[PDB]
Amino acid sequence: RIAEVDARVVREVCSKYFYDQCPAVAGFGPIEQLPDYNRIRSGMFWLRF
Amino acid sequence: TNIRKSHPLMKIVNNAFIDLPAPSNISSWWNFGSLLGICLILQILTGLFLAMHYTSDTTTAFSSVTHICRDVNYGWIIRYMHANGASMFFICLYMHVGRGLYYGSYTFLETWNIGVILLLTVMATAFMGYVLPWGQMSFWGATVITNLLSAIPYIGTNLVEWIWGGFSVDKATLTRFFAFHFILPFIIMAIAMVHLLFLHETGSNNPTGISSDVDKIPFHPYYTIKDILGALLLILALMLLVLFAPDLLGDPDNYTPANPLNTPPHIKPEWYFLFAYAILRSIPNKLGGVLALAFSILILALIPLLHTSKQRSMMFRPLSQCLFWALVADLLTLTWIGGQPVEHPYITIGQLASVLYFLLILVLMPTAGTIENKLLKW
Amino acid sequence: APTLTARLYSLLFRRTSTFALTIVVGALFFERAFDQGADAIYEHINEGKLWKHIKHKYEN
Amino acid sequence: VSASSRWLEGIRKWYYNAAGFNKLGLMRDDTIHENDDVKEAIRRLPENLYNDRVFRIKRALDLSMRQQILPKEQWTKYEEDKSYLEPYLKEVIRERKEREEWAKK
Amino acid sequence: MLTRFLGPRYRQLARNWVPTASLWGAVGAVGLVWATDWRLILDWVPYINGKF
Ligand code: HEM
Ligand code: HEM
Ligand SMILES: Cc1c(-c2ccc(Cc3ccc(OC(F)(F)F)cc3)cc2)[nH]c2cc(Cl)ccc2c1=O
């Protein structure tokens, strides 16, 4: 199973599961600098791509 | 790591617009300050395209403006946009000032005073613009404002002659008014940069009047989209005026060429100065009238000194709210009176309105503040 | 996938270059469509008044 | 009991209800304008009172954002609103006036 | 003299990024044609051709 992976498969799987997805975020402690949820969400894609 | 936070030029924009912490509960009244940013640029654009077809010669000024209206491709659109943008600018400006007065934003003394300077500069630019068409009202407004400095003792006539560049209003006056009208908006923009700079240090206010460091959100994307919506509504109102009522806020008399001999019997200035024209008509005294006119505008500089309440904003101060709306109604009364002939009973009403205006600003607001301080037991 | 919006997302709106291409093509067609509709409405409201309605009478 | 005191109590209760800061769940001392004296007085508060003040202000700001108010059963009662920032601000003003009096000489 | 960028990794990266560059070029071309109202190209488009 491992030997059959290549760059194309990794790109397709990552584009499926990461790109332009709504994440879940948890923060604990001095987290005043943690970005807003809109900023985290907008960081899940690129305008160049 | 991120170029946005380390580049020399983009860092300023990042700290000014993108990552600025702002309160989460500022209402729509905070949009007007951004709208004044838009309108200014609009007047710089449209006006810059009117200067490519305008000639300041006294014999070929009215004709040049009619050439712009009739011969230039889409020139009527640009002309009437520049004409109504002044009314939009002054509506936004008065809303900005009322917002600052109601919610106690005047405690930022530096920003407040720089804003007073900006208000005076914009008033001068608007007045100098209205002379360039060279109609009846242009001539008889330039005459009156230039003679307004004749009340100063011992130097009045010389200053009047120096501003006129002659013994009367003539070609030299029109040319220098054109030059000043061209150049002054750039100075206004330069001062507005300082208006923003002094506000960057202290942060912004909110309707509650309570410090909002606990609840902050980034400026982008939350107040960029509200800026876009406000700009859209502004464009809607401006285009409604331009396309469905091009001459509602104007005056017919400025469509006749300037006549140095005759004077219309119902002279009046533009709608956004009438209140001053109501004050000056009230006092039957030249120097007293001019001083009252100056003080009615410069009394905003003394507003921070008269604050006597423990609470910053009027959100929790019912008596102050009642007095504020009485002041607004009185300003509307003065604006109504300024458009009427000097005759009975409007003289008495104008005098009473001016007295009420000054009394409300100077006497009653601190008294209400002190009474409210005693009611809350502190 | 059966839904129209799912097809539009999976086909066009995933990438941003395709999003921009869709926007410019939509603007290109929407310009002509809106112009024709507005001109038709304006001509119908003011029928028998515009120059083009009374043009045939005078020019030979 | 005094009739003048009764009228003062009635007027003060009426004005408290009319001011409306209680509808957001705030107390009177939450709404004070913060200057150097008040900043020092707040800096001297203990932990629990400071945290309570922070949470009350935060909830009020959220209600103001959403253009809502609390239900009538959670409004601050006029009689139970006891000032917590009185002695601290009193002592700070006293010290400042002592400094000014020394400076006069 | 940018000879640092001749290797398998850079040709692989170029192969990956070619389609997006082509799409952005197409966006630029279509935008230019739509903005300039260039009749030379637009006269061949079926529904647009009726506007002239
Ligand atoms: C804050 C900026 C400005 C304001 C508030 C303003 C205001 C005005 C007003 C009220 C008028 C009278 C229009 C009328 O009664 O028909 C006017 C006319 C004029 N303005 Fe401005 N203006 C501004 C900036 C500029 C600039 C930057 C220029 C040129 C670079 C310019 C060029 C002109 C010209 C040529 C006229 C006379 C032509 C006409 O009658 O339309 N303006 N302006
Ligand atoms: C062309 C003139 C002006 C421009 C371009 C301008 C622009 C702005 C902008 C962009 C802001 C920040 C956004 C906002 O708070 O809405 C602002 C805030 C402010 N301006 Fe102005 N302004 C002008 C005139 C004035 C005047 C005449 C006054 C007062 C007499 C004034 C007083 C203030 C105050 C007090 C604030 C801060 C409000 C607060 O946060 O409590 N400005 N202005
Ligand atoms: C008082 C008065 C005015 C008038 C003119 C201007 C203002 C406001 C103003 C004030 C100062 C100013 O210059 C400054 F900002 F200081 F540089 C620019 C504008 C207020 C009123 N304008 C009239 C115009 C006609 Cl046509 C006739 C009579 C009147 C009339 O009696």
Characteristics of this structure?
5 chains; B: 378 residues; two-stranded antiparallel ribbon; 13 helices; 2 strands; globular; E: 52 residues; 63% helix; binds ligand JHB; oxidoreductase
Describe the protein's architecture and organization.
- The structure is cut from a larger assembly and holds chains A (49 residues), B (378 residues), C (60 residues), D (105 residues) and E (52 residues).
- Chain B has helices at residues 10-18, 32-50, 62-70, 75-102, 109-131, 136-148, 156-164, 171-202, 222-244, 274-282, 286-298, 318-338, 346-375, and strands at 21-23, 216-218.
- Chain B has a single domain (3-376), classed as Cytochrome Bc1 Complex, Chain C (Up-down Bundle).
- With 378 residues, chain B is mainly alpha-helical.
- Chain B has a two-stranded antiparallel ribbon.
- Chain B has 13 helices and two strands, in the order αβαααααααβααααα.
- By secondary structure, chain C is an all-alpha fold.
- Chain C has one domain.
- The longest helix of chain C has 30 residues, at 16-45.
- The radius of gyration of chain C is 20 Å and the shape is elongated.
- The termini of chain C are far apart.
- With 105 residues, chain D is mostly helical.
- Chain D has helices at 3-19, 36-43, 47-66, 86-104.
- In chain D, α2 (36-43) packs across α4.
- Chain D starts with a helix and ends with a helix.
- The relative contact order of chain D is 0.15.
- Chain E is mainly α and 52 residues long.
- Chain E is elongated, with a radius of gyration of 18 Å.
- The chains are: A mainly alpha (49), B mainly alpha (378), C mainly alpha (60), D mainly alpha (105), E mainly alpha (52).
- Bound molecules: protoporphyrin IX containing FE (2 copies) and ligand JHB.
- The site of the ligand Cc1c(-c2ccc(Cc3ccc(OC(F)(F)F)cc3)cc2)[nH]c2cc(Cl)ccc2c1=O has 15 residues of chain B, from α5, α6 and α10.
Summarize the structure.
This is part of a larger assembly, with chains A (49 residues), B (378 residues), C (60 residues), D (105 residues) and E (52 residues). With 49 residues, chain A is mainly α.
